[PDB]
């Protein structure tokens, strides 16, 4: 079974910082694999928003304009892990954040996700 283990949610003051991590296991990975890890957030009364995505081998990254420059995603390729660093957290960042993994057309999502309250 493919599993994503998610951690780092919590309660923080506005303007604070947090670091989510997502260790993925149960599938083979190589360099030049068409692989992404990312983070998606959901909140009451709002749509599902893709927060960040990384190609963990090549290091290319995407951010939503709502967090671009404030957030930063990174990869830990030999530990098959990704990290999302949050800084200058706004009240509007209050949401549940789910790790995304994408492997060659197969989409995997966090078993629970984790809650960020600002």
């Amino acid at each position: 079974e493919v599993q994503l283990v998610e951690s780092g949610g919590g309660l923080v003051q506005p303007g604070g910082s947090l670091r989510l991590s997502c260790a993925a296991s149960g599938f083979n990975v190589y360099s030049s694999s068409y692989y992404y890890v990312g983070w998606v957030r959901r909140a009451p009364g709002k749509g599902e928003e893709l927060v960040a995505r990384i190609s963990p081998s090549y290091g290319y990254t995407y951010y939503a304009d709502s967090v671009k420059g404030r957030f930063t995603i990174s990869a830990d390729t030999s530990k098959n892990t990704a990290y999302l660093q949050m800084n200058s957290l706004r009240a509007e960042d209050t949401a549940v954040y789910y790790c995304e993994v994408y492997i060659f057309g197969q989409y995997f999502e966090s078993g629970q996700g984790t809650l960020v309250t600002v």
């Binding site: 030049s32 694999s33 068409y34 090549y58």
Partner: protein
């Protein structure tokens, strides 16, 4: 098994597409010359010249789009929205190109 680098595969396809686009542009340039040399006396001069000119403009445009499709990296997730839009557009222009070449044939073979 160890996978392909899908960006290199997609670039090599975009290159073969640019090569076939060149071969078609060179055929339609030859058709244009062979029509313009016959001139206004030919029965279908106006529509055939218009069709070939449209086809060439579209082909040069698709060649430019294929340059940009080779420029951007299909591994880069920030570029997905551009590579996807550019490839959809290139496929749609190649569709209009093939339709116009169907009509260029339907006139030329007379």
């Amino acid at each position: 098994n160890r996978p392909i680098n899908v960006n290199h595969y997609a670039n090599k396809q975009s290159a073969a597409e640019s090569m076939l686009d060149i071969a078609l542009l060179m055929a339609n340039a030859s058709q244009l010359k062979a029509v313009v040399e016959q001139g206004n006396d030919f029965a279908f001069f106006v529509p055939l010249v218009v069709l070939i000119s449209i086809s060439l403009v579209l082909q040069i445009g698709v060649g430019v789009l294929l340059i940009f499709l080779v420029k951007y990296d299909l591994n880069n997730p920030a570029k997905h929205a551009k590579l996807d839009f550019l490839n959809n557009l290139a496929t749609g222009l190649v569709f209009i190109i093939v339709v116009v070449n169907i009509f260029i044939t339907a006139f030329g073979v007379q």
